[PDB]
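Write out the bound-state structure for NAI.
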Amino acid sequence: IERPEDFLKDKENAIQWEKKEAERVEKNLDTLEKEALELYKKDSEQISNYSQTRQYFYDYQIESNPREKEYKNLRNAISKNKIDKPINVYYFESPEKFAFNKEIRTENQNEISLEKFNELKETIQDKLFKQDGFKDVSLYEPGNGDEKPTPLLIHLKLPKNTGMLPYINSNDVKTLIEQDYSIKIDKIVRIVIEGKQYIKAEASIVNSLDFKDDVSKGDLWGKENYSDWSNKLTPNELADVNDYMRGGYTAINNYLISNGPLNNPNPELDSKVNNIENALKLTPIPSNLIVYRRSGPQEFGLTLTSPEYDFNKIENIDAFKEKWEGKVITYPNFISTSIGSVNMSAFAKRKIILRINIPKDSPGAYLSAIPGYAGEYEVLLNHGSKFKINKVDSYKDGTVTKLILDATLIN
Ligand SMILES: NC(=O)C1=CN([C@@H]2O[C@H](COP(=O)(O)OP(=O)(O)OC[C@H]3O[C@@H](n4cnc5c(N)ncnc54)[C@H](O)[C@@H]3O)[C@@H](O)[C@H]2O)C=CC1
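---
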């Protein structure tokens, strides 16, 4: 264990240790892995952008995408070298990455105002931001002579068995990792580097199961944890869950959406809602989990024809973010989600993807585990759930621009 957990400002020693590690690791790489790495060090932009949105297309599209082969080989090379002890890394990020769509300070100013610092603090306070894709990080705190692209520096601690790939490009050593978690900013402080102030954000990792395009593995997990869910429900609860799935969902959910429980109380429907809710609390979600929902425009106050629903125009995206980013949306109805991120027929035309982080022990059930409900990958969430929208991103799906909403269940 000839390595500290954090090299701090000691650049010289950080580089010396990593230079050797790089040489060591490269000898454990296959021709294909080396191939991919060479392509990366020549065009990081494309490959990185791809690694961030690859999971949202049809399974058919993913398999035939040229970049998929590159992604898989690079992904393998990374997970190849798991660190034996934790390590802290450093990297500069754009504030926009955290929904702070303003400037902390210009490149010419040296100080950061109190107002700006408080506004940033409140924006990236109690929020989990999902991170995905390849990213180059540094093992030491930037200093005199180092590149400082933005006024925001992230100091992140990576867990024991995190994959990390030290590599040599031209003459300098670099570190590649693949983000597959959520980050929480615990504290932000001002630090000065060469006369200029920078925000240093102390960040921690929050892990969650995210099957992404691997629907088969997610289905296996869902069946394993809910195979006997139906066998534990009382006759009444089973009958109501069955009715709900058999077509009763429309009446039940319409009743909830129109505030029936408080505007036109229906004893028969309230009973079913109660049994279904209790059924969802019988076997709470076993661990932190990410689910996906392709939403219709109505869920966000729009219609298929609404002019603001055309995200191909950047004006409409900005309008959407001003209204929903950082806000909380409440679903009166029970809400269906999928354990997989892949696009599917029937939802192919929807433009809004809600990517929800479900905390361990939240109510929920894998409906596709019920006898006579296969190849559906469905997770049902409780009625009245509240989701905090942390960030809005966009990507192009063919000729249509679509949105990805990074949200957290906060019920
Ligand atoms: N949308 C998804 O991502 C997934 C849907 N499914 C299943 O596939 C089937 C059909 O898909 P959907 O049309 O999504 O069915 P849905 O049963 O969830 O809802 C039908 C319609 O009501 C909506 N709606 C829901 N909450 C609303 C709210 N709070 N305010 C205004 N409008 C609201 C949707 O916009 C949708 O057009 C469903 O039976 C569902 O269980 C399965 C996995 C994922």
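---
The longest helix spans residues 235-257.
The chain has two domains: 1-209, 210-411.
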